[PDB]
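Recall from the previous chapter that SMILES is a line notation for molecules. Here it describes chloride ion.
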Amino acid sequence: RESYDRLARELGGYRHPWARVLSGPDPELTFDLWLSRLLTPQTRVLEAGCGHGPDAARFGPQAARWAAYDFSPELLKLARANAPHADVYEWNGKGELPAGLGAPFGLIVSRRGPTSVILRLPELAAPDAHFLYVGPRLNVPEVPERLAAVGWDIVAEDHVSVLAHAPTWEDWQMRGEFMGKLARRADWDAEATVRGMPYREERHLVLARQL
Ligand SMILES: [Cl-]
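With both inputs in hand, we obtain:
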């Protein structure tokens, strides 16, 4: 059904869509650790691009308040149910802030989400707030550039890379589409092992603050 594809696109919006097996540690483990260290029962959190609330549900109760936003109204319905403690807002990240957002925040976080939110940090951040981000590639140049543009300092940065395999040709193809690089049977036929096709899952972690 088409109702399934939509759902799948939506729940999967912040992940890679193809089947894959990691040969090493999940490259977002460090991001989870850093996020966990930053949360206290006094912390006011803003999460950009919350999707169906997985992080709101999982880390949200550890904070004083977890405010979160995304664009899709139906997806936000799941987020509200997934995380009853969270305050969830429908926003495309542009123009004026949603009414009731509740700035200022001590933490602004984004897991592979919007990076334009960086340019709103002067309007969103309490003094001594942190901005925490992980991007779906080894280096996401706009993040450091945008943080420089608002006079924020990077206090921690990680460029992470982990061997993975796409177990089948179909999976390799699907990755090719997501990446905008067409998969070719030649490369599969010549380089695929029993594990399938090898590639790197890479992430760029950034923790910043205005010192
Ligand atoms: Cl989930």
